[PDB]
């Protein structure tokens, strides 16, 4: 006699080729300062069915996105002044904020080492992303 | 869907500051006094949907005071700032409180004890308690570090949705599609001794 | 805009599109909302818009219209009102009342605009604070009156009492006179027990707004009404019974059965202490039968938050805990109280379970106020034998991790090292760890047996949890030193033995990591122990050198404060040699230190130095301790001599950014081992200090060399900040010596005159962006210390320092925050300790030196701000005391004035009410040098006044003149009563101090009485 018993990320489909936490900004062209956009974890996501890479970065705690973009190929990750660990690239269609927006955006890390990992990783993404 | 959240406090307690860090991430290190009221939408993700609060970031110093409390009517929900680095806002804390309940008089209020990353505090945390006759939640927090910065909205949330297990969830992420840059290159990064 | 026509006052003001703004910006959004607000904000502030407000409140189809008439209205009444003509006053103060009474009488309007409502009740009660009793006798025989003809109106009466008795009692002390709000506290007294009748009357008679209006009124005057109308009435029984039954009235009677629980009252009446005891009676009796009883589940019933439950619970919380504080004694000894005793505490410990911080707080401070008197009170503490055992349960249970164990759980369940500190939760650690001491005290037999035995199920498996092995471990550390070094001994054997067992039988990095933090914690809380097991202190610490290769940098970065905070205790059995060892450990632990810190990250590796120094100065022996220092030193030592070879070579070696790493490296040692040792690292000091100075002007050449070819972004560039850092470090460590020198001699002799050398004139001739604040801070330690040995020297850094950086920092109050801060503590301490070096400097650079002080104090930086008056303070100390010489006379002459206005200026202006204090003591000190005749020579240039004229006399007419023009809207006779009173009470600060806050009320508003000044 058997008793009755009691009775979306978007990133299911995507491979995880590369985290590391990370401080991102934005450059405010009319004032010339850099603002900070968000702190957290830096993901290069790889889509299982179009094998494209994007970088995926979402804020603690809020986990609201700060970077949403395709790790494109023209692409160039450029030195800062004040910085020996983080890079600055030009971006033309990053979504994190709903429409695609172009930035120039700087990304820094802990350690020079994950600076430049990050740059490997980023290259290698890029050469993915051409295929 | 939407809620008016009302912010009060002294002047320099860093209410835009918390404000701005909520909708674009940055960190504000100018203090623009606040002219009345500044109005902004602020959405979070939760799994019971989005819940919106349009909030009303108002003026602490009485010289740019505006409406006053003419800015609380029917406020849904409320957060009092101070500064643990400042004695006299956390003394004021009564008058605000006091001219808030005035015009709601049952609404969740969130109290914050702002700026802790500041090493040498001086409203000592036994000293915090306010609260407790009040029925006020509060919190230590930090628009600089971030501490505790999203307890406040996600406390008012479970009052305002009635779901005391409601929590933050992440945002679905959908797939994306000029002399500019030497200037942002030799513009120094700010901060350069953070962790981060 | 369209909207911006209520703007133009010549002509008449269309109520319709006042109502269309005021939607707009209530009900609107984005720039419409935005250009709305500033044209609501500009209407509400012409001085004339109150002329408006009849038309707006009669005509108007919008509530918040009308409100923001009655806010236009209230700025009037609380600022403008004496200057009306009185015909105006009648007659704002008929429409007002008129107003209420008709919006009352209307039951919808009454059920549906509570805000307007409330809002004009608040308008009233300004009026009444303006106008009452003395042009207004009758308005409480005619509430009262009012108040039986309609329900609405004596609901609406209520709230208007309310408020009343929060303005003249609550609020009254920041916003009134003391003379005013002595006036209304008096004359809401004398008519007190006509509206304590009305009061009760309505209570017993029984609709239920119009009782929680009452109740909410009631609330109010228990925080002033005499007792008697407390404890002589029936109103106890009322709140304790009838009012705890309905839900509807529940919460506010709570409230004010809290309030009753600390009216004052009489310590012998038997009477009184009857009826104390019977409302609590009735009040438990209320909650266990018509709201939970004693054995509910609260913990869950807060989680759900239903309805009101968790304002409900945070009430009796509050209740409780403030009633039994005060009255448990009288529950203590009757045998018949005991069970209400016990139920009242039972309560609590279910209160206590709920999951939220600041309601455990409330309940943890007082369970705090519990056990220490227990722990005192003879013949109390067997009473409470099992509340207090079920109370080690929860604190056991709920412990908070303390500051030491760095490790956390991640939302993706691995054991991580945390991003920051939980800055919010010492406190909490401190005061459960003061209750849990006082627990164990209490019985040390239940404590140990629920701690081995909560042990025993971690080991067995039946409550393993990383919760639980966490919470047992920070409570078992937590209470070292309670018990008997004996039982001590023992228990932590058991303790430690079972931790052993638990690591081995868990498999995996997390569970390793989490069982060796708590391993960790456990052994560093008892060096009690450690000092009497060597075999075992010695064990502990090579595992703690095992752990500094982890990868986990969670448990390696714990190791290394675990081996400190052990060293800063049991320090003395390093140093000596143990029975059966071949030589002391500190000899040991120097030879292997490039091994054992080899994969340490430099701060970790310092903070390893940094112990080694705190054991090393347990040698006393000066040979012994020296060669001890030098030992340690060699590796940095070796280091420092090779890079000293090399750069004074070539120095474009020092150019290498690796290099620039490693000497930032070497001095950061040295200043770890200096934070130690203090006055016993001179030796080492010794050994690099001349190399270190070259070195600092090399490093100074090249970030000047840098600026010069790149431009000020250099010093952005980590090349640069690197070079920086060095400078820095060698100022630090340069510091940190002088600060704990005890031979001052050599310093002096030795050390000062190299480094003013080396660090003056490359700070002077640096562009304001190259300089480094830490000069100055190094400079104010020298000047500390030794700068009464060097006057000259003191005098080279003024010289050196001072006018370059006042000009950096005058020309706002952000730029260059910590230049500002050393610089005011460095004038500071040279005004203290060397004030000579002030009496040299030239005319000019003295009167930019009195500029400097009043910039300070015009600063909302508290850290400048303070500074700055205690400097003014200091100045004037300074210069009375040189009594009547000529620098002193001519400092009154050209300086007196300046220091009166610009603190009158800080303490007037509203922006500076942190410095109230200190502002008040410094006018104090500067009228008293007056009134007692110690300006030697007159304030007054000569024919300005009559010759035999007084400086008492001047100073008066020159404040009157001073406030007449500065606040215009004051009269005559407040400022010659304000001058009269602050005058006469320069001797007594909190008079003075009175008479200050009183004259900053009257600054405010208009037609202040000159007679509130006479206040005694
Ligand atoms: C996991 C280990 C595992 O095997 O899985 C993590 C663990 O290694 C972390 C250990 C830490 C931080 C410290 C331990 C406690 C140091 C060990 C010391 C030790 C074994 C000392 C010996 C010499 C010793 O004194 C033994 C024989 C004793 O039985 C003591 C454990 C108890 C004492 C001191 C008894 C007595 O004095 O009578
Ligand atoms: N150190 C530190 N500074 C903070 C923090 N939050 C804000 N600040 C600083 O405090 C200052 C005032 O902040 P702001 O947000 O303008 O204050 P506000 O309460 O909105 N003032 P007003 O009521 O006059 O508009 C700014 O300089 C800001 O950078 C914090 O968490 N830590
Ligand atoms: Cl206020
Ligand atoms: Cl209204
Ligand atoms: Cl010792
Ligand atoms: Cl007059
Ligand atoms: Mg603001």
């Known amino acids: 006699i058997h008793f009755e018993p009691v009775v979306k990320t978007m990133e299911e489909d995507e491979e995880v080729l590369y985290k590391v936490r990370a401080k991102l900004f934005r450059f405010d062209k009319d004032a010339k300062e850099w603002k900070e956009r968000g702190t957290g974890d830096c993901k290069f996501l790889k889509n299982k069915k179009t094998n494209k890479v994007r970088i995926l970065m979402r804020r603690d705690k809020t986990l609201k996105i700060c970077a949403n973009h395709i790790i494109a190929p023209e692409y160039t990750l450029k ?21 695609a927006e172009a930035f120039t955006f700087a990304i820094r890390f802990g350690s020079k080492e994950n600076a430049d990992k990050f740059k490997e990783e980023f290259e290698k993404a890029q050469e993915i992303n051409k295929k | 869907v939407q809620f008016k959240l009302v912010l009060v406090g002294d002047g320099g307690t860093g209410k835009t500051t918390f404000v701005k860090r909520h909708l674009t991430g940055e960190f504000e290190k100018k203090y623009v006094a606040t002219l009345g009221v500044e109005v902004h939408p602020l959405v979070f993700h939760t799994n019971r949907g989005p819940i919106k609060f349009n909030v009303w970031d108002t003026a602490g110093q009485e010289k740019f005071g505006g409406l006053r409390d003419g800015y609380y009517i029917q406020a849904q929900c409320a957060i009092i ?116 | 805009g369209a909207m911006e026509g209520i703007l133009d006052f010549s002509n008449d003001l269309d109520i319709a599109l006042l109502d269309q703004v005021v939607s707009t910006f209530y009900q609107g959004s984005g720039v419409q909302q935005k250009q709305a607000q500033e044209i609501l904000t500009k209407f509400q502030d012409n001085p004339d818009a109150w002329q408006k407000a009849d038309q707006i409140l009669q005509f108007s189809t919008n509530p918040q219209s009308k409100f923001i008439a009655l806010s236009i209205l209230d700025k009037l ?25 008709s919006m009352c009488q209307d039951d919808e309007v009454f059920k549906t605009q509570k805000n307007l409502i409330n809002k004009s009740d608040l308008t009233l009660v300004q009026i009444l604070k303006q106008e009452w009793p003395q042009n207004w006798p009758e308005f409480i025989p005619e509430l009262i009156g009012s108040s039986s003809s309609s329900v609405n109106v004596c609901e609406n009466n209520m709230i208007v009492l309310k408020l009343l008795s929060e303005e003249v009692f609550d609020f009254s002390a920041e916003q009134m006179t003391q003379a005013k709000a002595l006036h209304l506290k008096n004359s809401m007294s004398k008519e ?42 029936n109103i106890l029984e009322l709140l304790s019974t009838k009012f705890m039954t309905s839900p509807d009235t529940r919460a506010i009677t709570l409230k004010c059965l809290t309030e009753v629980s600390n009216l004052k009252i009489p310590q012998d009446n038997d009477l009184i202490k009857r009826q104390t005891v019977l409302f609590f009676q009735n009040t438990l009796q209320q909650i266990a039968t018509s709201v939970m009883p004693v054995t509910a589940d609260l913990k869950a019933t807060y989680a759900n938050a239903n309805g009101n439950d968790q304002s409900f619970l945070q009430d009796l919380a509050m209740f409780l805990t403030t009633y039994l504080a005060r009255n448990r004694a009288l529950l203590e000894s009757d045998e018949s109280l005991r069970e209400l005793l016990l139920n009242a505490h039972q309560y609590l410990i279910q209160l206590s379970k709920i999951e939220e911080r600041e309601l455990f707080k409330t309940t943890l401070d007082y369970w705090h106020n519990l056990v220490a008197d227990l722990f005192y009170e003879p013949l109390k503490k067997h009473i409470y034998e099992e509340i207090c055992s079920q109370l080690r349960l929860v604190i056991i249970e709920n412990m908070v991790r303390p500051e030491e164990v760095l490790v956390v759980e991640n939302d993706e369940g691995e ?205 006393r022996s000066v040979a012994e301790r020296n060669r001890l220092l030098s030992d340690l030193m060699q590796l940095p030592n070796m280091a420092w001599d090779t890079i000293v070879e090399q750069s004074t070579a070539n120095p474009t070696l020092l150019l290498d950014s690796e290099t620039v790493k490693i000497i930032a490296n070497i001095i950061k040692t040295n200043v770890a081992v200096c934070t130690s040792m203090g006055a016993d690292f001179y030796p ?278 001073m406030l007449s023009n500065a606040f215009p809207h004051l009269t005559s006779e407040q400022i010659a009563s304000f001058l009269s009173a602050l005058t006469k009470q320069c001797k007594d600060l909190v008079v003075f101090k009175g008479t200050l806050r009183d004259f900053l009320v009257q600054i405010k508003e208009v037609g202040g009485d000159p007679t509130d000044y006479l206040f005694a």
Not at chain 3, 87 to 93: K, L, M, N, S, T
Not at chain 3, 457 to 477: V, Y
Request: proline letters at 4%; charged letters at 25%.
């Open chain 3, 192 to 233: 007190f027990e006509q509206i304590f009748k009305l009061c009760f009357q309505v209570l017993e008679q029984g609709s239920s707004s119009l009782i929680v209006a009452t109740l909410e009124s009631l609330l109010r005057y228990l925080h002033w009404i005499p007792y008697r109308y407390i404890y002589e009435t």
């Open chain 2, 81 to 196: 700032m101070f500064d643990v680095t400042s004695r006299v806002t956390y003394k004021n804390v009564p008058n605000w409180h006091r001219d808030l309940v005035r015009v709601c008089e049952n609404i969740p209020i969130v109290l914050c004890g702002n700026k802790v990353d500041i090493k040498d505090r001086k409203v000592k945390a036994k000293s915090i308690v306010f609260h407790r006759k009040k029925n006020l939640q509060y919190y230590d927090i930090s628009a600089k570090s971030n501490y505790n910065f999203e307890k406040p909205f996600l406390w008012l949330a479970r009052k305002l949705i009635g779901d005391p297990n409601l929590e933050f969830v992440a945002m679905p992420a959908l797939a994306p599609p000029e002399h500019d840059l030497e200037v942002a290159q030799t513009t120094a990064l700010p901060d350069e001794d953070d962790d981060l």
């Open chain 3, 684 to 961: 080492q000091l010794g050994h690099i200090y001349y190399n270190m100075l070259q070195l600092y002007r090399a490093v100074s050449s090249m970030i000047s060399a840098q600026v010069a070819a790149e431009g000020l972004i250099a010093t952005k560039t980590p090349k640069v900040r690197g070079l920086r850092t060095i400078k820095k470090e060698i100022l630090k460590l340069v510091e940190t010596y002088i600060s704990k020198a005890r031979n001052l001699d050599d310093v002096v002799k030795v050390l000062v005159e190299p480094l003013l050398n080396a660090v003056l004139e490359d700070y002077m001739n640096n562009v304001p962006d190259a300089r480094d604040a830490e000069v100055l801070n190094c400079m104010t330690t020298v000047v500390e210390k030794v700068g009464h040995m060097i006057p000259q020297g003191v005098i080279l850094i003024l010289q050196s320092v001072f006018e370059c950086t006042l000009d950096m920092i005058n020309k706002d109050f952000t730029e260059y925050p910590e230049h500002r801060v050393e610089f005011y503590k460095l004038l500071k301490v040279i005004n203290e300790k060397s004030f000579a070096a002030f009496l040299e400097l030239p005319p000019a650079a003295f009167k930019l030196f009195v500029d400097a002080i009043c910039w300070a104090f015009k600063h909302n930086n508290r850290d400048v701000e303070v500074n700055g008056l205690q400097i003014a303070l200091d100045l004037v100390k300074n210069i009375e005391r040189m009594g009547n010489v000529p620098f002193a006379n001519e400092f009154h002459k050209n300086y007196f004035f300046i220091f009166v206005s610009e603190t009158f200026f800080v303490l007037t202006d509203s922006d500076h009410k942190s410095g109230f204090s200190k502002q008040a003591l410094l006018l104090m000190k500067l009228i008293s040098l007056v009134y007692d005749n110690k300006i030697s020579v007159p304030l007054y240039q000569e024919a300005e006044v009559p010759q035999g004229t007084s400086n008492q006399v001047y100073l008066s007419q020159y404040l009157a003149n």
């Open chain 3, 415 to 619: 054991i991580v090292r945390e991003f920051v500190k939980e800055s919010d939760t010492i406190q909490l650690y401190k005061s459960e760890r003061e209750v849990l001491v006082y627990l164990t005290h209490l019985n040390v037999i239940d404590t140990e047996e629920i701690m081995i035995s909560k042990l025993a199920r971690q080991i067995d498996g039946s409550e393993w949890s990383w919760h639980n092995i966490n919470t047992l471990s920070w409570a078992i550390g937590s209470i070292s030193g309670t018990m008997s070094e004996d039982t001590e001994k023992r228990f932590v054997v058991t303790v430690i033995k079972d931790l052993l067992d638990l690591c081995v039988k868990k498999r995996g990095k997390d569970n390793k990591a989490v069982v060796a933090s708590d391993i960790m914690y456990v052994v560093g809380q008892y060096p009690r122990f450690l000092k009497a097991h060597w075999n075992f202190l010695r064990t502990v610490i090579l595992k703690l050198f095992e752990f500094m290769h982890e990868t986990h940098e969670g448990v390696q970065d714990m190791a290394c404060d675990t081996f400190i905070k052990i060293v800063q205790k049991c320090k003395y059995h390093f140093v000596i040699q143990q029975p059966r060892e071949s030589e002391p450990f500190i000899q040991t632990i120097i030879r292997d230190i490039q091994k054992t810190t080899a994969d340490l990250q430099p701060q970790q590796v310092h903070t390893f130095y940094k112990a080694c120094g705190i054991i090393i100065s347990e040698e």
């Open chain 1, 79 to 99: 030195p800062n002044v004040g910085s020996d660990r983080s890079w600055v690239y030009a971006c033309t269609a990053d979504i994190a904020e709903g429409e």
């Open chain 3, 77 to 101: 009444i609380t600022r403008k009102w004496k200057l009306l003509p009185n015909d105006h006053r009648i007659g704002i103060r008929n429409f007002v009342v008129g107003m209420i009474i």
